[PDB]
Amino acid sequence: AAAIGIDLGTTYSCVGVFQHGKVEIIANDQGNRTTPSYVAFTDTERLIGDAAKNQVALNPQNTVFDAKRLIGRKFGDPVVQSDMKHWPFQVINDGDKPKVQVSYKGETKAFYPEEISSMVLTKMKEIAEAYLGYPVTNAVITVPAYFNDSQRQATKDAGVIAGLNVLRIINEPTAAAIAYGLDRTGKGERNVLIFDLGGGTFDVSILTIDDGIFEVKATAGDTHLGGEDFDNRLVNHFVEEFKRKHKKDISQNKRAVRRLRTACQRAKKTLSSSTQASLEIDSLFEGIDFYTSITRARFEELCSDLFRSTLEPVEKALRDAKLDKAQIHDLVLVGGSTRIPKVQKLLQDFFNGRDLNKSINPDEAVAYGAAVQAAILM
Ligand SMILES: Nc1ncnc2c1ncn2[C@@H]1O[C@H](COP(=O)(O)OP(=O)(O)OP(=O)(O)O)[C@@H](O)[C@H]1O
Ligand SMILES: [Cl-]
Ligand SMILES: [Cl-]
Ligand SMILES: [Mg+2]
Ligand code: NA
């Protein structure tokens, strides 16, 4: 039986398996090759993944997301106390550990972060089992390089709770490097830069690889910079467009804003491969249809400062590693947001025209590498 590799993301998770000489990134029941790290509780059922995120009658208080921001932290951790202010779900204190509190089947319940993340991992396990046609019992799971012992432990515990023997916890950037076969180099140092822009976070990592041994030389980035921030620029843009056109403010109608935000995420993805996108929402506010469009160039303007801000952390990482641009051997794109053409241009220009490694869907590279390493360890 094959073991699986799982990228347990802040916003999207991905599962792959190595068999018959090659990695298969496994699509879920809706055909999506990555799955939202969402769990929802209703009066009748628990929903995970696409079903949780896509609720037609979504209940903000009982739909949990961002558990990765809590996992392995103390309740009194200032990161937790800050993050709590912007979530619609309740976080409580159980002996200086955080728990997320919800209503389920009519009663108030609370769950540790590693419990919420185990539900996401169970979904990923099941996605794999459907494809393989047998039970999966071993996995490699990835984490950010900056994770500490407590965060790594809680992640491993989420795996155990989901019925997985965790062969190893490995760093996300190391997994992306493995996906591209960069661990296979002989003796002699090669410097690799991983540029990772996901849904919620931005991670720059510089790795030295020598005869298959990885050293983390430098890390930089921003834990509150990702695709969702580009979403929010589009939402604010269209809220102003609706005001102009209909003389109505929709900003305080939570439902209209969620429905607009979903459509902005869909348009954004489309703008990575087309130069314009149409956005059409039936009865968005007080029965008014909102049918409009957005160009790639306009989307770029709306986000220009955010896109540009990704480069100073690259500069910083290089200084910390005591390396010049020219001394990086390989540049690897990771994270869904690096599909954005403008982001690719900025990083390529900064590196004076160097090739980017982008042949593996960037939001799949970490799971791909995890799957490769899981097979080695078996
Ligand atoms: N083609 C695309 N163009 C632009 N953005 C995209 C595209 N495909 C996915 N995204 C965006 O990528 C983001 C998710 O990326 P990813 O799957 O790397 O998340 P992740 O692994 O959870 O990372 P993090 O923990 O940083 O959120 C979302 O904001 C999503 O809209
Ligand atoms: Cl599914
Ligand atoms: Cl479900
Ligand atoms: Mg990540
Ligand atoms: Na992911």
Each domain of the chain, given as residue ranges in start order, spans 1-64+120-184+358-378, 65-119, 185-226+310-357, 227-309
Residue 24 is among the residues annotated as catalytic for this protein: no
Of 53, 66, 68, 115, the catalytic one is 68
The ligand that comes nearest to the alpha carbon of residue 28 is 2
Query: Is 31 within 8 Å of 42 (Cβ atoms)?
Result: no
Nearest Cα residue to atom 2 of ligand 1: 269
Q: Assess if CATH 3.90.640.10 describes domain 227-309.
A: yes
Method: X-ray
- C-alpha to C-alpha distance for 374 and 168, rounded to whole angstroms: 8
CA distance 283 to 242: 12
Number of Cβ within 10 Å of residue 312's Cβ equals 12
Q: How far is CA 376 from the centre of its chain?
A: 25
- Residue 214 Cβ inside 6 Å of ligand 1? The answer reads no
Distance 134 CA to ligand 5 centre (A): 24
Fold assignment, 65-119: Defensin A-like (3.30.30)
- CATH number for 185-226+310-357 (one of 3.40.50.740, 3.30.420.40, 1.20.140.10, 3.40.50.2000): it is 3.30.420.40
Same fold, 1-64+120-184+358-378 and 185-226+310-357: yes
DSSP state of 26: P
Pairwise CA distance, residues 358 & 331, whole Å? 9
Query: What is the topology classification, in CATH, of domain 1-64+120-184+358-378?
Result: Nucleotidyltransferase; domain 5 (3.30.420)
Which helix (H) or strand (E) is 127 found in, with range?
helix 113-132
Alpha helix (H) ranges present in 271-328?
296-302, 304-308, 311-321
Ligand 1 pocket, residue 199 CB under 6 Å: yes
CA–CA separation, 22 and 13 (whole Å): 20
> CB within 8 A of 71, min separation 6: which ones?
113, 114, 117, 151, 154, 155, 158
List of residues 6+ apart from 25 with CB closer than 8 A? 14, 15, 16, 33, 361, 364, 367, 368
